[PDB]
């Protein structure tokens, strides 16, 4: 196999963060070198699977799953359904917590705690080289 890693990315749906996910994303494929597995690429398995099994199928293909928050569509739906894992000792740290950007989230997602955090772009050679790691 390749030494590359696939990462999902979750994250809110509201209009006014979709520039910050164009931005993250094109640092994920370029600076980070990751495969990106993005909602907004995948329409059409997401039609055919549903929301909740794509995300459950995504969730097991990524080697790094990411919460990507300012500072909900598929978002509250992902941590509904991710959260038990985050502290799971079967896939260490898997799930990562991402600031990046402006906006106003509504709900409360307290479990994102218990995940490595990184404030970008101050963080990014930290979450770069968490990635990294996983290609060892």
């Not at 699977?49 to 790094?64: F, H, I, R």
């Not at 409360?108 to 772009?121: I, K, T």
Request: with cysteine; glycine share 2%.
């Amino acid at each position: 196999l390749l030494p590359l890693i696939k990462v999902l990315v979750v994250y809110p749906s509201e209009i006014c963060f979709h520039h910050t996910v164009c931005r993250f994303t094109d640092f994920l494929q370029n600076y980070c070198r990751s495969e990106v597995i993005l909602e907004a690429w995948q329409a059409a398995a997401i039609a055919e699977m549903g929301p909740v099994q794509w995300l459950t199928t995504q969730k097991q293909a990524a080697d790094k799953v990411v919460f990507l928050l300012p500072s909900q569509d598929l978002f509250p739906l992902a941590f509904n359904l991710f959260c038990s894992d985050f502290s799971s000792q079967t896939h260490l740290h898997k799930y990562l917590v991402v600031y990046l950007g402006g906006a106003d989230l509504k709900g409360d997602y307290n479990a994102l705690s218990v995940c490595p955090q990184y404030h970008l772009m101050k963080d990014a050679t930290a979450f770069h080289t968490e990635l990294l790691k996983a290609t060892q």
